[PDB]
Ligand SMILES: Cc1ncc(COP(=O)(O)O)c(CN[C@@H](CC(=O)O)c2ccccc2)c1O
């Protein structure tokens with residue numbers, strides 16, 4: 001499906017971006033001297049070079065060349081509060097007043113843990129980590145240590161952190177858990193794998209919607225299979241809700257009425273501060289009670305850091321309440337529906353998939369149900385879309401994902417929709 | 432070596448602590464409802480229950496019962512700046528002004544990376560993570576992916592993070608890397624292991640001084656063996672300098688004139704914000720250049736977060752300069768020497784081991800060279816010491832470790848020394 005016409009368009013788009021952004025280009029050359037590819041977070045890199053941002057307030061930011069954008073990326077769902085939320089700021093100020101690096105417990109960690117347990121229906125007890133990666137690693141540590149088993153079932157296209165990256169199948173850098181990969185949403189194939197491996201299965205690890213892998217919702221039949229089979233064979237079902245937890249007050253599990261044995265959390269819950277968490281069934285999580293004989297150990301210098309504890313409690317109780325989550329997801333559904341309406345109205349061979357305030361463009365009108373479907377959609381048009389949106393002052397992920405923050409308003413949503421319509425018109429010959 | 436007299440003393444000490452701290456006791460009972468054992472960082476727990484701290488400024492903090500302490504723990508070496516450092520505060524303010532969760536690169540990450548590369552002599556390129564745990568996992572990911580080998584040599588008593596905890600040998604929660612454990616400082620035994628396993632050795636992972644494992648310096652012969660054997664067999668030598676990096680401007684490697692292939696960093700370098708890093712030889716780290724064919728992936732939501740980037744650059748360039756590191760280590764050496772002088776003057780069967788500003792008490796006058804030596808020292812007296820120091824308004828780790836912050840001054844050092852002398856006098860019958 002790769003064509004020379006599209007490759008020529010991409011070359012032209014990259015060239016225009018380069019010409020537009022010489023200050024960012026200068027930054028990149030300098031950054032390469034201290035970091036591999038001038039990079040410390042792989043997903044931030046794109047050709048010909050990434051933007052460097054100077055400053056941002058609310059939903060807007062400005063690059064080092066002075067161009068302004070509305071930020072539709074929202075820190076891959078962590079940046080729910082925009083760039084300068086006054087309640088987050090107040091929480092940071094309160095944290096400084098309590099004191100940094102106090103080397104001890106404060107009440108703030110307990111208050112934050114209570115806020116998490118209150119709203120997530122399957123989390124009876126929780127522990128905080130410093131990232132979604134650590135949360136998922138600790139969930140696997142819990143499952144393997146409790147069951148004494150080695151096999152982990154996960155899914156092709158699934159992303160669970162820097163050491164558990166299955167976005168393109170097995171990565172040589174992944175931690176060497178014995179992972180068997182299924183096809184997302186594939187009931188019969190997955191049922192077969194669970195017949196074969198169920199006996200040695202410590203855990204099933206699954207996102208209720210592929211996040212990085214394309215905003216691909218799980219189907220109920222698929223999740224029902226995993227819940228029934230985990231219970232049958234004695235594996236722990238782990239829902240990775242690092243992204244999906246935002247979709248309702250109680251995440252995907254509240255929406256579905258399906259409870260995982262363990263749940264991992266990340267992104268926005270710490271108020272935009274470093275954050276992850278793992279929690280779940282009381283009888284599983286109690287294995288970490290340090291007063292218990294044979295307790296599992298889980299240290300971590302910054303687990304209880306005052307900034308995350310303070311900003312996280314503010315995030316859940318003062319800003320993104322359960323009602324706020326319902327409201328934002330409804331807003332996101334209307335937004336996604338409008339984008340899809342624009343595509344249909346214009347006979348465009350594209351769609352936006354997702355749930356609530358999360359969505360990704362795919363250049364296909366086939367059902368998008370697994371990693372294979374995402375990969376089969378037109379990747380060249382996806383790149384062209386990214387550069388087009390940038391030229392229109394709209395910033396979203398290179399991979400075509402948006403994650404609406406609470407600061408996105410009518411003006412931003414209107415601008416996105418108009419820019420989409422303009423893309424369809426201007427790139428008609430390639431569509 | 433356990434006696435009933437010491438057990439009775441411990442029971443009495445725990446009872447006195449409980450009576451002194453009923454508000455902390457009340458907090459603990461509530462915390463148990465949301466976190467396993469009311470805990471989110473295992474090392475913070477101790478019997479009968481841990482203190483809850485209300486507030487701190489500089490080197491001092493106050494518990495929820497109103498008692499004041501000087502903080503000699505210093506966040507297990509991360510809390511180098513005390514509780515309210517004005518330069519860290521200024522950096523946090525600057526970070527808020529730049530904007531939170533900007534979803535893009537800023538110049539701040541490059542400036543911070545430059546500061547790291549400038550002072551650490553074996554780090555040609557660096558990438559930031561969210562914890563020392565992630566840094567060490569990524570170092571192992573790098574070594575195994577580059578070499579195509581599976582075996583990792585590490586050491587009994589070694590601590591490399593929540594998924595790489597060898598403090599008490601193999602932990603069932605550890606990530607399932609194929610780890611072979613040697614005895615720290617054991618040249619002949621380790622040489623034997625490297626003859627057996629060298630061919631399949633992806634990495635040797637070692638702290639230049641056991642940190643959590645007792646502030647036990649590595650001997651030069653031991654480190655020379657590892658450097659020679661890693662080079663001979665093609666394994667990557669990884670120095671875990673998460674704690675030791677503070678000991679000079681260029682960490683232990685500058686002090687030793689031995690260069691590791693990869694170095695991991697953590698703790699204070701991010702200004703007390705969430706932080707880890709892995710760096711090392713250019714040709715190894717370039718494998719992460721995202722523009723390269725077959726690049727290794729290393730994402731992480733908070734890797735480049737503006738608070739860590741800002742406070743970290745301030746930490747290294749405005750506060751804890753290379754000269755500041757030399758000065759603090761010299762201060763720490765004088766402090767440790769004074770503690771040891773007090774022990775010798777009083778014929779006390781105890782010593783403080785360590786380097787620079789890091790030290791741990793051991794109730795033995797035997798050489799402390801490996802995990803076995805630390806474990807063989809009197810553990811009951813160690814517990815008694817912790818409670819004694821608390822009663823004197825001096826806070827250090829339950830395990831008897833201090834990590835001097837830049838805010839520790841004459842008054843605090845004098846109080847510690849006097850409290851040590853008082854312990855020796857008051858507990859004479861047990862010594
Ligand atoms: C579903 C999911 N689970 C875990 C993670 C890991 O969380 P941390 O990044 O906090 O360790 C993630 C992270 N998604 C982001 C990470 C980023 O660098 O923004 C990501 C990763 C790869 C591609 C796109 C986005 C999840 O999403």
Ligand SMILES: Cc1ncc(COP(=O)(O)O)c(CN[C@@H](CC(=O)O)c2ccccc2)c1O
Nearest residue numbers: 299300301507562563564590591592642643673
């Ligand atoms: C030498 C060393 N390497 C790695 C780590 C892991 O760093 P993170 O805690 O940032 O993931 C550490 C951590 N040491 C502390 C952790 C804490 O919770 O304070 C620790 C752990 C266990 C016992 C005592 C101190 C290293 O020290």
